[PDB]
């Protein structure tokens, strides 16, 4: 289209296929992640639900309507930043058991 809203937002010529190949890379990098962590469960659920929304979308305006969190390249930016954290979530191993104890009366407020 022409004259989009935001400043740092310049959409591509074919948004749907870019968003699809973003979400296939999401499913791939999530495929690196082990199973028993809940991160895989919730992210694969939400990305397969959003991709299943997108698979029946021929029109850009119709996808901006039905998918919530629009309009178009805000969704793409959301996807790109989710991909970047997934690449970081191979690292840091954040599904470990709980790190060690507080003083156990630290959060008792009225002191």
């Amino acid at each position: 289209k022409k004259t989009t809203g935001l400043v740092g937002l310049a959409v591509c010529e074919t948004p749907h296929e870019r968003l699809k190949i973003l979400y296939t890379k999401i499913l791939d990098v999530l495929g690196h992640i082990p199973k028993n962590a809940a991160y895989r469960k919730y992210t694969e659920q939400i990305t397969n639900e959003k991709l299943s929304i997108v698979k029946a979308e021929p029109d850009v305006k119709k996808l901006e309507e039905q998918l919530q969190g629009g309009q178009i390249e805000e969704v793409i930016l959301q996807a790109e930043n989710e991909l970047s954290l997934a690449r970081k979530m191979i690292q840091w191993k954040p599904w470990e058991p709980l790190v060690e104890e507080p003083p156990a009366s630290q959060w008792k407020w009225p002191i």
């Binding site: 809203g5 935001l6 400043v7 740092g8 937002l9 930016l77 407020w109 009225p110 002191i111």
Partner: protein, 376 residues
């Protein structure tokens, strides 16, 4: 420096009239307000929130009183809500006209300063007639508005709103599609909306650069749910468009004040709890419980349950945040202020990377910095 609105030390390590770096050193106006409110009580330290931001004399009072009410689980009566929203838009009008005026002084533009400060003299006469103060009206006790308006205010608000619509149209006649003011300030101060999110910018910056975001129509914290208006959003960067955003917020503020005069109920001044607000004179001079509540409310202050709360209002500079930490006590433990002036000041170098010093002055001008609010 006179273009330094207030004081702002600025070590600009430049290449000649076309820079390299600039560093805003602030803290020259540091006063210790957080430590002072740590060593005071609530009602005794409310004038710190008069004096912190020294333009929004009613908005920050609204912010702190709603912080105490949101902590304290108390709804004020709706007449005080309508009057507080009325003065919130009035002080919003005063803040927008000071922003236009200080940008006019930072850009040149000598006379609209004088025109709109005659109008702001009329504004100050209104504050005098209401609260008895010149420029720092406390007037907003936590627990509803105390010492309400007399007969002889709404007439002046009506006639002044008509005159002010005429005067803002005359300001759009003089400036606002002028040739060389526009050619002076369009092509400067562009910030990408992704980074306008992630530099912590708020309010008018997020208006003018991209995103659609208003705390008023997204979060009802007062009687804003019953009034109707519209707020301008920015095309693409372009400080000229930010100026147009300020002017249209002014005119829509006049529309909100017209609606609020259309919807004013004559119910009551303060809350129905003498353990929150002090009683009035007849009950003070006759009834026993009123004198006991008066005396202990002005010695100790009302006891406040412990809680670490935060709230934020849509001040005309942006997301004015007040963060209270209250022990079960009569003194709050620790309070802090999120300043939109501080947030907009944080991106000064990035707004002024590839320009000259004249644009550095105009980017100080494009954001109504006051630095009492920035200091904490």
């Amino acid at each position: 420096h006179p273009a330094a609105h207030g004081v702002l030390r600025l070590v600009m390590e430049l290449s000649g009239e076309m820079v390299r770096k600039c560093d805003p050193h602030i803290g020259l106006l540091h006063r210790g307000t957080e430590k002072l409110i740590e060593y005071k009580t609530y009602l005794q330290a409310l004038p710190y929130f008069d004096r912190l931001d020294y333009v929004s004399m009613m908005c920050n009072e609204q912010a702190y009183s709603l912080a105490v009410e949101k902590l304290l689980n108390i709804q004020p009566p709706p007449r005080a809500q309508w009057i507080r929203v009325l003065f919130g838009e009035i002080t919003r009008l005063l803040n927008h006209i000071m922003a236009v005026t200080t940008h006019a002084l930072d850009i040149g533009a000598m006379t609209p300063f004088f025109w709109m400060f005659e109008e702001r003299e009329k504004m100050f006469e209104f504050y005098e007639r209401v609260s008895g103060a010149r420029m720092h009206a406390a007037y907003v006790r936590p627990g509803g508005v105390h010492q309400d308006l007399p007969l002889g205010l709404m007439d002046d608000i009506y006639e002044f709103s008509k005159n002010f619509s005429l005067r803002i149209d005359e300001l759009e006649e003089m400036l606002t599609n002028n040739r060389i003011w526009r050619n002076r300030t369009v092509d400067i101060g562009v910030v990408t909306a992704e980074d306008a999110l992630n530099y912590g910018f708020s309010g008018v910056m997020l208006r003018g650069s991209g995103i659609q975001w208003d705390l008023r129509k997204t979060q009802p914290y007062d009687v804003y749910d019953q009034v109707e208006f519209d707020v301008p959003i920015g095309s693409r960067g372009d400080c000229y468009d930010r100026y147009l955003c300020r002017v249209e917020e002014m005119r829509q503020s006049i529309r909100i004040i017209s609606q609020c005069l259309n919807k004013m109920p004559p119910g009551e001044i303060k809350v129905d709890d003498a353990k929150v607000s002090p009683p009035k004179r007849a009950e003070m001079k006759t009834s026993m419980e009123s004198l006991i509540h008066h005396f202990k409310l002005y010695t100790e202050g009302y006891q406040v349950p412990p809680g670490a709360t935060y709230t934020a209002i849509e001040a005309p500079k942006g997301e004015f945040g007040v963060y209270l930490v209250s022990d079960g006590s009569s003194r709050p433990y620790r309070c802090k202020i999120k300043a939109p002036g501080f947030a907009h000041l944080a991106g000064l170098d990035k707004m002024s990377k590839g320009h000259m010093l004249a644009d550095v002055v105009a980017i100080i001008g494009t954001q109504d910095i006051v630095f009492g609010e920035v200091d904490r």
